[PDB]
Design a protein around this nucleic acid. Structure first.
Ligand SMILES: [K+]
Ligand SMILES: [K+]
Ligand SMILES: [K+]
Ligand SMILES: [K+]
Ligand SMILES: [K+]
Ligand SMILES: [K+]
Ligand SMILES: [K+]
Ligand SMILES: [K+]
Ligand SMILES: [K+]
Ligand SMILES: [K+]
Ligand SMILES: [K+]
Ligand SMILES: [K+]
Ligand SMILES: [K+]
Ligand SMILES: [K+]
Ligand SMILES: [Mg+2]
Ligand SMILES: [Mg+2]
Ligand SMILES: [Mg+2]
Ligand SMILES: [Mg+2]
Ligand SMILES: [Mg+2]
Ligand SMILES: [Mg+2]
Ligand SMILES: [Mg+2]
Ligand SMILES: [Mg+2]
Ligand SMILES: [Mg+2]
Ligand SMILES: [Mg+2]
Ligand SMILES: [Mg+2]
Ligand SMILES: [Mg+2]
Ligand SMILES: [Mg+2]
Ligand SMILES: [Mg+2]
Ligand SMILES: [Mg+2]
Ligand SMILES: [Mg+2]
Ligand SMILES: [Mg+2]
Ligand SMILES: [Mg+2]
Ligand SMILES: [Mg+2]
Ligand SMILES: [Mg+2]
Ligand SMILES: [Mg+2]
Ligand SMILES: [Mg+2]
Ligand SMILES: [Mg+2]
Ligand SMILES: [Mg+2]
Ligand SMILES: [Mg+2]
Ligand SMILES: [Mg+2]
Ligand SMILES: [Mg+2]
Ligand SMILES: [Mg+2]
Ligand SMILES: [Mg+2]
Ligand SMILES: [Mg+2]
Ligand SMILES: [Mg+2]
Ligand SMILES: [Mg+2]
Ligand SMILES: [Mg+2]
Ligand SMILES: [Mg+2]
Ligand SMILES: [Mg+2]
Ligand SMILES: [Mg+2]
Ligand SMILES: [Mg+2]
Ligand SMILES: [Mg+2]
Lengths: 184, 184, 261
RNA sequence: CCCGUCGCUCCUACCGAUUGAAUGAUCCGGUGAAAUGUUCGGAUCGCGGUCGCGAGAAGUCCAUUGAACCUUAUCAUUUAGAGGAAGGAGAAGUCGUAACAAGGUUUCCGUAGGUGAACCUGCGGAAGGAUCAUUG
RNA sequence: ACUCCGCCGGCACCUUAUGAGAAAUCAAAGUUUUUGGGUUCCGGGGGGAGUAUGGUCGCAAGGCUGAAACUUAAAGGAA
RNA sequence: CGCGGUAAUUCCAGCUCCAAUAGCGUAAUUUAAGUUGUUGCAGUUAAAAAGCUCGUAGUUGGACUUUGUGUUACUUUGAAGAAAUUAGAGUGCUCAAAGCAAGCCUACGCUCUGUAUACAUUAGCAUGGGAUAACAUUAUAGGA
RNA sequence: UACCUGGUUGAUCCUGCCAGUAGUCAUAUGCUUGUCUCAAAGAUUAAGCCAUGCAUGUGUAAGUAUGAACAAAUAGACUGUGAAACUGCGAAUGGCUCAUUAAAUCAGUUAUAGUUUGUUUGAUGGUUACUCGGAUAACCGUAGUAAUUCUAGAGCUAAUACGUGCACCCCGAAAGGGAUGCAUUUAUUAGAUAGCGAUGAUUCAUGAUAACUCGACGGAUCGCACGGCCGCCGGCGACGCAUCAUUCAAAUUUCUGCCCUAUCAACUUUCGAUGGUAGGAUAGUGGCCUACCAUGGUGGUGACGGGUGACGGAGAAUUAGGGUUCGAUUCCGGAGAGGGAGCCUGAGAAACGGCUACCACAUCCAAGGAAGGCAGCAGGCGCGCAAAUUACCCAAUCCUGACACGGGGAGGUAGUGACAAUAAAUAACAAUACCGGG
């Protein structure tokens, strides 16, 4: 099957390598997951070397995404793949791979923001909410996309390896970089 | 694998480089007939053994006299020559090992000592006595004429207790003749 | 090979076992255990080749299956159990108790012990690190793991382990001036005072050891085992006391023995 | 003493029309078993309240790995060949006499032409020449 | 211009062996079994043969590179 | 190399003698071979100096610096290094090739019995030495 | 033993080779052969083809007995032994061979801060439950087929089989609630200094926090012994699950090192060649693979290609020294199982005394099908100059399983055996006759 050996490669000088042994099981590869965004979740269990387990996600719809500046992580629905640095064909096929830029539902984070800062984007409770409002700062670029209900996010997990699609909300100069790539 | 394959074995003689040198043929036949040897092979293995001893001494003599290996193995070689009666306590130097000859080794043979101690009438009579189980070195019967006697063992050479010449009953020739005489 | 080798050819066995080359095609394959297979002495060798209690491979199994042999205070029934340096072997029926120590020629010697001294052993500390829940632990070179060790204990130190309480009674820091034994290499079995430590970043650390008679020899840190603080070891040593004699000196003793004996 | 053609026998190798042949390998291309992943499929079984839930075979779809076979091409090795032609060997063939003496035209090198054959001739060179020598 | 003494460089010659060499002979062809200053090319019995083949150069003549099968107990150097 | 052509020391035989001897003859490779030459060969005439010169890589390069954190080679010592084989210590398997045993006395046993040691290119690792040698460097000192 | 001798001439001194001389753990063959010890043996040509038999199975007091099994007893679940069968484990070691393979294998030397690792050993696993459910084997009895450890249906019943299941922070009218074992995935945060661990060196070990997963995890198991409290409590073991360390190992990997050939001088790169970025895949690093980008990489210090009657090494023969030649074969490493490819199971295999396919060979058939892999041991054919018994045994060495006990063509024993090696008979003595010397 798929093999990760170097025997089929050319030498650094350019000469060929004559085969001196058959393929080994301990140097195999496997078919890519090609995880897609779909509400029909499907993750198949793969037995790997040592009797260990890998989770190969064929279809996913939700992910665990973290708002780094706010230090809050929420499970949210994945809406769309918008950018992929490796292959633009993975964008129109809606493939979920590590480091792909996706849009996630902003609703779970809005609820936390309202519950935490008391703002939309009980005597002892109002005492602390206003206290936390003193040091409240929200990026203009990050707030502008709360109106549409979608947040740009980057997948930080490997769905074909762990079976999950987790990530973090884009912000700072990383958000500026990617939103300029989408400005066409 | 067979364990017997690990048993060592070696050669005990080399044939001459020049097969028909009249001088050598004359000298070798004189030693063969003097010491009652079976063939030239018995003389060639003694020369082979002597060459090994001399070669060891030459290597030691080429080293510094303060070299620990020179001191340790040199003493062992001298001790070995003394224990067989080849060297004397007054010849405790490696240079005297280089002066050894074939006659020195042939004089330590059991065949030679059985003859020169008076037990046998001729060097050829000693040969037959040894192979016929009439001699013993201490308590052990020895039927090998090439047995190299040690100085500490030379005084214990005597007839075997089972021999007609050492207290045993008469052989089968006298016994049959006695039986025939009795029948008369 | 497609996996693990289960056989040990006799000529490939460690030389310090002193197995005769024509005794058979195979040697006992040491089982997995606290000590490495090249630095151990399987119980079958001890019971049959060293102590002569067993005459055959079969008889060693009979002895062990009666639960008559203990290693580090616990009964062992595995014929190829890898007993190693500082291990305490006890045989209650014979009232015997030995400690596995190297003689000055690099071979394991069954050093008979007194009943009092057979209640502990020395172990060399491999490393100290935090485990799960931030609990510190240390592991040794005999496969043991001790949780909540004294904070002063560090790598390469020696700990005195009580075989009954299974706790660290005392430890010796690895430092210049202590008496150590060499547990590997050319100088295996030699005892001396650690005189110097030469560190080389990224490379092995060399230690210079001086014998009681002034003979100095070097070796790698991994082959050193501290035996005591200062100059007195915490364990009983064999007759040689780690003093390696020259072949000339050894021959001198042998010659004198024949004159007297 | 000795050179070559020619003539006879045998042995080794070479050239050679045959778009020679055989065998093996490799590249590209074509076709493509099986397996695996995917898609669809839902025989059948079980479990709940004649509708749900779960499991799921055959088969099917796309992809991957890819044997195998079939081309053209290339390479490798072996081998046939009318005829041409080289060398060597083979007691005591034919024709001369070229090399050895100044060998009867001193020999030899390079090159060119010519002749049954060795060889001959032209031009330049060498002595390994048959001259170490003309202040005559 | 010629005569005499000398220095450096060059083409050579003559005598000689304390040298070398199989010798002829050589003042280098010497300072080599008492074997080593540096470096390039190149030979390994006689033939087959500077031939066959492939490559390369040339208008050609040919040049450069360059085998094997097989054959033979000598061929050869100096005296 | 030669023997045999009517007086064969050489063929076929007998006899006798010779060599090795339970072995000996016949049909790739080492030695001999200083006929592959690093040690250590040849090239005037025996086989062998390119017709001549230039020329890059390669190889080889004068003398000089203390006697009385530039980088390397070299040398010294050490560490690490499978066994078996080789060398070698001990040991009377009856000797031997071997083997790794055994020995001591006569008790309910002993010698902690022995099962040494050396060698092991090159490369790598680590100390000491700094002659010889290689590379790098130097004057608008970016100097100490 | 640091050695030479014959051969060119009428004779001489040379060059030079031919021939002789000696060895080979070096093969074959010829003739010959009494004894002791030791001992190689279908590698060379054909990794050619194989009849037959055997070479891997496995049971403890301790997973599961209702044999319609045996033995001994005599209103009880069982509890003497135990075939069969399920379950568990092993069969990835060993043995064989040298075909392919020339910086590759391999050797010494490194690295994993770049990974996986059944087992062993050590440590560590939170503050209906007096015990759940449905199946199935053996057995039983209807069978099919020419036929195979080929196969269908029916009736029963077990489990350590299978499927289940008791088992600090945030919100906040400080009540209450959420999360709260271990593991999994992502993000934020601490991991100082010179309370606070390690390294030559790590945002490392490890901690805290926010969530996440539709998590084979966190014991529905077995033997023995009976005791102590007044139903309660409790001993010593077996087996099993998870985590870390350890051990047994592998995978990949650093540096240096390999024979002949230039009548092989350029090679590599569209379809990965060299490197970069982002992914995918993998136990994990890596053009290992994909997308995009750059134009690199190697070479007279011999790349690339070709040859090898080339597995590499430890080593073997011969050796004054230097050297030459050999290295299929018992130790180590690698590789293969007629040729390729693919794969399941599993901790571990691209396994072949496992499976699937193709190709090549070839067996049985009632012609509808079915079963094949001796470069394991012995044996046969063929090939050849060239190589043994279709033997006995697990007693030794050791390996393996549930196991003190079973099994082992591994291994040993004997047979054949002038491969090779060791010791060593085939006469000794005396008197006569004969013949010498001092
Ligand atoms: K492997
Ligand atoms: K003429
Ligand atoms: K002439
Ligand atoms: K003419
Ligand atoms: K002049
Ligand atoms: K010499
Ligand atoms: K298994
Ligand atoms: K290596
Ligand atoms: K190599
Ligand atoms: K990888
Ligand atoms: K890359
Ligand atoms: K398994
Ligand atoms: K056995
Ligand atoms: K067993
Ligand atoms: Mg194997
Ligand atoms: Mg390190
Ligand atoms: Mg004429
Ligand atoms: Mg004329
Ligand atoms: Mg003329
Ligand atoms: Mg002169
Ligand atoms: Mg010379
Ligand atoms: Mg020639
Ligand atoms: Mg006659
Ligand atoms: Mg003759
Ligand atoms: Mg020659
Ligand atoms: Mg010569
Ligand atoms: Mg001439
Ligand atoms: Mg000439
Ligand atoms: Mg100089
Ligand atoms: Mg010589
Ligand atoms: Mg003549
Ligand atoms: Mg010869
Ligand atoms: Mg007898
Ligand atoms: Mg079973
Ligand atoms: Mg090649
Ligand atoms: Mg390399
Ligand atoms: Mg960390
Ligand atoms: Mg990458
Ligand atoms: Mg690409
Ligand atoms: Mg080879
Ligand atoms: Mg081959
Ligand atoms: Mg080999
Ligand atoms: Mg072969
Ligand atoms: Mg074999
Ligand atoms: Mg092997
Ligand atoms: Mg394999
Ligand atoms: Mg076959
Ligand atoms: Mg296979
Ligand atoms: Mg088989
Ligand atoms: Mg197998
Ligand atoms: Mg034979
Ligand atoms: Mg006879």
């Amino acid at each position: 099957g798929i093999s990760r050996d170097s025997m089929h490669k050319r030498r650094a000088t350019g000469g060929k390598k004559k085969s001196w042994r058959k393929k080994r099981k301990y140097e195999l590869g496997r078919q890519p997951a090609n995880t897609k965004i779909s509400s029909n979740k499907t993750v198949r269990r793969i037995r790997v070397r040592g009797g260990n387990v890998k989770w190969r996600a064929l279809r996913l719809d939700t992910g665990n995404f973290s708002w780094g500046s706010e230090a809050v992580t929420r499970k949210t629905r994945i809406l769309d793949v918008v950018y992929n640095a490796s292959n633009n064909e993975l964008v129109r096929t809606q493939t979920l791979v590590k480091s792909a830029i996706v849009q996630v539902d902003a609703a779970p984070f809005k609820q936390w923001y309202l519950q935490h800062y008391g703002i939309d984007i009980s005597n002892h409770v109002v005492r602390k909410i206003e206290n936390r409002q003193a040091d409240r700062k929200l990026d203009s670029h990050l707030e502008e996309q709360f109106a549409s209900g979608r947040l740009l996010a980057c997948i930080s997990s490997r769905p074909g390896q762990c079976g999950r699609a987790d990530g973090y909300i884009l912000e700072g100069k990383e958000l500026e970089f990617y939103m300029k790539k989408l400005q066409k | 694998v067979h364990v017997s394959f690990y048993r060592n074995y070696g050669k005990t003689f080399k044939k001459p480089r020049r097969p028909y040198e009249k001088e050598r043929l004359d000298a070798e036949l004189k030693l063969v007939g003097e010491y009652g040897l079976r063939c030239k092979r018995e003389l060639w293995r003694v020369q082979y053994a002597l060459s090994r001893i001399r070669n060891a001494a030459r290597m030691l003599l080429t080293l510094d006299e303060k070299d620990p290996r020179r001191i340790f193995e040199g003493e062992a070689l001298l001790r070995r020559m003394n224990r067989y009666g080849l060297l004397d306590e007054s010849q405790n130097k490696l240079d005297y090992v280089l002066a050894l000859t074939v006659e020195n080794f042939l004089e330590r043979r059991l065949q030679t000592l059985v003859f020169k101690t008076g037990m046998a009438k001729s060097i050829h009579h000693a040969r037959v006595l040894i192979r016929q189980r009439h001699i013993r070195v201490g308590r052990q019967v020895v039927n090998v004429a090439s047995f190299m006697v040690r100085v500490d063992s030379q005084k214990h050479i005597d007839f075997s207790l089972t021999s007609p010449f050492g207290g045993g009953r008469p052989g089968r020739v006298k016994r049959k003749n006695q039986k025939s005489a009795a029948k008369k | 090979a497609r996996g693990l080798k289960k056989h040990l050819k006799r000529l490939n066995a460690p030389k310090h076992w002193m197995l005769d080359k024509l005794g058979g095609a195979f040697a006992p394959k040491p089982s997995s255990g606290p000590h490495k297979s090249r630095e151990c002495l399987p119980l079958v060798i001890i019971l049959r080749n060293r102590l002569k209690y067993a005459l055959t491979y079969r008889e060693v199994i009979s002895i062990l299956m009666q639960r008559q042999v203990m290693v580090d205070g616990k009964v062992r029934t595995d014929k190829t159990y890898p007993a190693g340096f500082m291990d305490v072997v006890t045989i209650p029926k014979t009232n015997e108790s030995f400690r596995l120590l190297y003689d000055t020629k690099g071979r394991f010697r069954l050093h008979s012990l007194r009943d009092e001294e057979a209640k502990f052993k020395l172990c060399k500390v491999r490393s100290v690190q935090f485990g799960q829940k931030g609990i510190p632990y240390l592991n040794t070179y005999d496969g043991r793991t001790i949780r909540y060790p004294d904070p002063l204990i560090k790598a390469n130190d020696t700990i005195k382990l009580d075989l009954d309480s299974n706790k660290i009674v005392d430890f010796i820091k690895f430092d210049v001036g202590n008496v150590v034994m060499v547990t590997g290499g050319r100088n295996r079995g030699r005892v001396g005072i650690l005189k110097n430590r030469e560190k080389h970043k990224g490379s092995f650390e060399t230690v210079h050891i001086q014998d009681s008679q002034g003979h100095e020899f070097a070796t790698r840190l991994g082959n050193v085992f501290t035996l005591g603080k200062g100059s007195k070891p915490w364990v009983s040593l064999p007759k040689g006391k780690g003093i390696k004699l020259s072949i000339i000196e050894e021959a001198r003793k042998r010659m004198a023995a024949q004159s007297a004996t």
